[PDB]
A paper describes a structure:
One of these energy-consuming enzymes is the conserved huge AAA+-type ATPase Rea1 (also known as Mdn1), which is composed of a hexameric AAA+-ATPase domain, followed by a long tail consisting of an α-helical linker region, a flexible aspartate/glutamate (D/E)-rich domain and a C-terminal metal-ion-dependent adhesion site (MIDAS) homologous to the inserted (I) domain within the α-subunits (αI) of integrins that mediate ligand recognition. The conserved interaction between the C-terminal Rea1-MIDAS and the Rsa4-UBL (ubiquitin-like domain) or Ytm1-UBL is essential for assembly of the 60S pre-ribosome in a reaction mediated by the Rea1 ATPase upon ATP hydrolysis that leads to the removal of Ytm1 and Rsa4 from distinct pre-60S intermediates. In this study, we report crystal structures of the Chaetomium thermophilum (Ct) Rea1-MIDAS, both alone and in complex with its pre-ribosomal substrates, the CtYtm1- or CtRsa4-UBL domains. Besides displaying the typical MIDAS fold known for integrins, the CtRea1-MIDAS crystal structures reveal evolutionary conserved Rea1 specific structural elements.
Next, we aimed to structurally investigate the complex between CtRea1-MIDAS and its two ligands, the ubiquitin-like domains (UBL) of CtRsa4 and CtYtm1. However, purification and crystallization proved to be challenging and might have been impeded by the conserved but flexible MIDAS loop (element II). Since this loop (deletion of amino acids 4734–4773 in CtRea1, or 4657–4696 in ScRea1) is dispensable for MIDAS–Rsa4 interaction, we replaced it with a short Gly-Ser-Gly linker. Using these trimmed constructs, we were able to reconstitute the complexes CtRea1-MIDAS∆loop–CtRsa4-UBL and CtRea1-MIDAS∆loop–CtYtm1-UBL, which readily crystallized, allowing us to solve their crystal structures at 1.89 and 1.84 Å, respectively. Although the overall structures of the Rea1-MIDAS ∆loop domain in complex with either Rsa4-UBL or Ytm1-UBL are highly similar to the MIDAS apo structure, the terminal helices α1 and α9 were slightly tilted (as observed upon binding of integrins to its ligands for the C-terminal helix). The Mg2+-binding site in this case is fully ordered and the metal ion is coordinated cooperatively by the MIDAS and UBL domains. However, one unforeseen major structural re-arrangement concerns the Rea1-specific element III, which in the apo structure forms a loop that crawls along helices α1 and α9 and was not fully resolved, but in the ligand-bound form becomes re-arranged, the short helix α8 partially unfolds and forms a β-hairpin that provides an additional binding site for the UBL domains of Rsa4 and Ytm1. To investigate the importance of this binding site for interaction with the ligand Rsa4, we mutated two residues (CtRea1 F4951 > A/R; CtRea1 I4959 > A/R), which lie within the β-hairpin and directly contact the Rsa4- or Ytm1-UBL.
Author numbering:
A (entry chain B): 28 to 128
B (entry chain A): 4696 to 4737, 4777 to 4886, 4892 to 4997
Write the structure that this text describes.
């Protein structure tokens, strides 16, 4: 949207607790990147019906480091840039999905 | 502050290896282009810019290194165009910056040295993919070439060799630049590098796009739905390229010739 303040987007790779990929890679706007939006998104990509949604938590894999962040940040763009990922769209971000219930 | 370069020995062996790999493909592409191009004018000469993506997404091996496929394609296309002797061939690189790897006025790709010096400059590590800057610089380059030409009409063509991945908000930003190129009769053709050996889910044809409504329900789109380049082709195998690039240009010239 506006040049002066658009936050852009990144590409997400969803893997389950076995490490297996769950969906196609998907582009997500940083302005939408709440943990709850991403949970609804994963259930939609799996084609599950709206009342069938499994609530998910996500662990963030930091590219270029063997480092996983277990608590979802208030600002995902800032978290990634703090860890040296200056342009997240250039590299795919792996998210480990944790079914909550 | 100059850009990191491959070893020259590495670049020379790449050029020689790729030339051998692509020799029959270049011959097929040259034969087809001669018929397409050495009709419709060539009293006309062309100026062609091969614009190669130097960004680090080209190094992802979840997508089987698009940069490998792009440099093979570069050698194929540069050699096919060289035997035509119909105009000048230049090479631009782009990522965070835009650079001229080989000028329209530089030596022709008849020597291994000239090809190797180009491959040396591509390392696929730049931290962004600035396609808006690419188009601004390409338009400005070709416009200076026109002004030089008058003061002393070419057909000017840019071929973009890239995995085609930018943030989707950039698709709308590229549309006015493509209109500006078209107004100046610069033809822009995008060659999407999408290696067949990409892991499942990671092809450009598989990439999805999440749009959240006012209600917060996500609606799924496909990445290429809004891809702004009207003229492009998708390469999954090196061997795909001659047939598809020739078919695209043949069809475009059929239409512009009416
Ligand atoms: Mg890139």
């Amino acid at each position: 949207h506006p040049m002066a303040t658009d936050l852009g987007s990144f590409k997400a790779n969803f893997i389950d607790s076995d490490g297996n990929q769950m969906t196609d890679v998907v582009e997500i706007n940083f302005a939408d990147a709440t943990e709850k939006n991403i949970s609804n998104l994963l259930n939609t990509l799996l084609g599950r019906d709206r009342e069938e949604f499994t609530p998910y938590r996500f662990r963030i894999h930091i590219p270029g480091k063997d480092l996983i962040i277990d608590q979802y940040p208030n600002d995902l763009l800032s978290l990634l840039q703090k860890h040296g990922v200056t342009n997240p769209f250039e590299t795919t971000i792996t998210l480990s999905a944790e079914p909550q219930a | 502050l100059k850009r990191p370069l491959r070893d020259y020995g590495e670049a020379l062996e790449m050029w020689s290896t790729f030339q051998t790999k692509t020799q029959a493909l270049s011959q097929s592409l040259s034969s087809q282009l001669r018929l397409i191009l050495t009709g419709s004018g060539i009293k006309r000469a062309y100026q062609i810019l091969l614009c190669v993506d130097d960004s680090s997404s080209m190094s992802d091996d979840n997508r089987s290194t698009a940069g490998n496929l792009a440099l093979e394609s570069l050698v194929m296309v540069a050699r096919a165009l060289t035997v035509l002797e119909a105009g000048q061939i230049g090479v631009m690189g782009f990522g965070t910056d835009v650079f001229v790897a080989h000028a329209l006025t530089d030596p022709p790709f008849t020597s291994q040295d000239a090809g190797a010096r180009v491959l040396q400059q591509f390392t696929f590590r730049q931290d962004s993919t600035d396609m808006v800057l690419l188009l601004r610089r390409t338009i400005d380059h070709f416009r200076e070439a026109r002004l030089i030409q008058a003061s002393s009409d070419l057909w000017q063509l840019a071929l973009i060799l890239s995995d085609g991945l930018v943030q989707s908000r950039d698709h709308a930003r590229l549309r006015p630049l493509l209109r500006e190129a078209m107004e100046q009769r610069v033809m822009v053709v995008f060659i999407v590098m999408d290696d067949a050996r990409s892991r499942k889910g990671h092809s450009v044809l598989e990439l999805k796009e999440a749009r959240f409504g006012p209600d917060g329900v996500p609606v799924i789109h496909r990445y290429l739905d809004s891809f702004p380049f009207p003229y492009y082709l998708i390469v999954h195998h090196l061997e795909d390229l001659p047939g598809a690039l020739a078919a695209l240009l043949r069809t475009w010239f059929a239409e512009v010739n009416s």
